[PDB]
């Protein structure tokens, strides 16, 4: 009836799955080589028993802080508070979390939040993994990755959402392939496995990494997560049982199309079946790049941030880690500047 697969995911690079929220600069304190993210409710509760509600209001209502009235540690030190225990959680200081320094004026004015459930713990939603799997399957099938995937019957090209049949059709047997692939979500994997990586862009035309002011909360490298993929039909069962050897083919196409133009010391190596999860990995990892080439570039031709040729490579900075695999000692990256390929992960799928 149903075939249940276990997908073990090992992140080889930081993975960020946001929820639209952002820690502003007045929600975390950088001290003791750590980032403390206090709960503002408990913060207010213990500064109403200490009678500093009004100046906190003046600190947060304030619209244009100049350089230093924008940081919570400045408020904590100005009013002489040393009682830093109001719920929350701490992120250990990476080192490589940001250019400049985390002190001073610019530093980190915004931190993109990771997706968290109602209890405050992080998790990877099943719809993110399902979107990655759907991109892998659609990009490795000649009946889906062809010229019929674009809808030129309109003002601008757009994806043919009805190329893969879905939904109920009148007087017809159910023909929904992706209702059968039921990818579940993870379990809360604790707040100790998060870091504060920053987005860098590596241009092949310029040949140097350019940092950008876009800081994220991402899962640390070498994180083991487990997903359950329940399948009901034989077609989707064959597709999911071929998810490995399809991920390899998709990555081979991606490497021969995009990653080959960049220095081999930035591109990571694979231990298991490749996959790209979360934000910041790139547009080609989320598109049928065989068809989307030319259209996606033209979308950005009249903007200031012009997409030149096939674009830049997204290379975040996170500490180098070496895995003692039973073949030797495999370093995660091939460069000494600590450049991970943001959004990368590996997986192994079994049929438990």
């Amino acid at each position: 009836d149903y075939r249940t697969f276990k997908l073990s995911l090992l992140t080889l690079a930081p993975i960020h799955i946001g929820n639209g929220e952002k820690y502003t600069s007045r929600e975390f304190i950088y001290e003791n080589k750590k980032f403390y993210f206090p709960d503002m409710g408990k913060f207010y509760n213990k500064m109403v028993e200490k009678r500093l509600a009004e100046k906190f209001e003046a600190f947060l209502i304030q619209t244009r802080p100049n350089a230093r009235n924008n940081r919570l540690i400045s408020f904590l030190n100005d009013n002489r508070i040393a009682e830093r225990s109001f719920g929350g959680y701490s992120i250990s200081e990476t080192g490589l979390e940001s250019d400049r320094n985390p002190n001073s004026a610019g530093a980190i004015n915004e931190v993109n939040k990771f997706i968290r459930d109602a209890f405050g713990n992080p998790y990877i939603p099943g719809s993110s993994l399902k979107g990655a799997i759907r991109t892998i399957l659609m990009n490795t099938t000649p009946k889906w990755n062809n010229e019929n995937a674009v809808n030129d019957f309109g003002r601008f090209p757009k994806e043919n959402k009805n190329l893969i049949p879905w939904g109920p059709k009148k007087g017809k047997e159910y023909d929904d392939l992706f209702n059968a692939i039921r990818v579940s979500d993870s379990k809360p994997f604790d707040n100790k496995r998060l870091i504060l990586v920053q987005k860098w862009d590596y241009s092949a035309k310029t040949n140097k990494a350019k940092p950008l002011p876009l800081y994220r909360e991402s899962i640390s490298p070498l994180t083991k997560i487990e997903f359950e993929i329940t399948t009901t039909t034989d077609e989707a069962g064959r597709l999911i049982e071929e998810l490995g050897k399809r991920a390899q083919a998709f990555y081979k196409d991606y490497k021969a199309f995009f990653l080959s133009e960049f220095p081999d010391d930035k591109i990571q190596a694979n231990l298991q079946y490749p996959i790209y999860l979360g934000a910041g990995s790139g547009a080609w990892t989320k598109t049928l790049f065989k068809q989307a080439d030319g259209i996606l570039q033209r979308r950005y031709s009249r903007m200031k941030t012009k997409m030149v040729k096939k674009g830049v490579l997204k290379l975040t900075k996170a500490p180098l880690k070496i895995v003692k695999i039973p073949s030797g000692n495999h370093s995660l990256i091939k460069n000494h500047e600590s450049f991970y390929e943001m959004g990368k992960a590996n997986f192994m799928i079994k049929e438990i």
Partner: protein, 104 residues
């Protein structure tokens, strides 16, 4: 940028490929606009004249940037990006994990 400078070869390439004669102009939202509306917006203050234009593109994968030099106390030349720096690298993070079924 103080550790680096614009390379002479890239400057020459930009010079007689004449990329500065084919500037593109953008408004405050970064949308391409004609020079007339760019001038209009800059005059009325709705566009920042500094960060609102581009010098076309230089063809040929040339390196845009060279290292910048300075003088040491000996009176010798030295690259600005080399020196005492700091000393904090540890060794690595060996995470064992001698069970992962590595695909061939």
């Amino acid at each position: 940028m103080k550790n680096f400078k614009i390379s002479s070869t890239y400057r020459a390439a930009r010079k007689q490929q004449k990329t500065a004669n084919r500037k593109s102009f953008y408004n405050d939202e970064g949308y391409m606009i004609s020079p007339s509306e760019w001038a209009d917006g800059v005059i009325k203050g709705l566009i920042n004249p500094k960060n609102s234009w581009s010098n076309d593109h230089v063809k040929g994968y040339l390196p845009r940037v060279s290292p910048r030099s300075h003088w040491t106390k000996n009176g010798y030349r030295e690259y600005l990006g080399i020196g005492k720096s700091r000393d904090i690298p540890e060794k690595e993070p060996e995470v064992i994990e001698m069970m992962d079924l590595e695909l061939v």
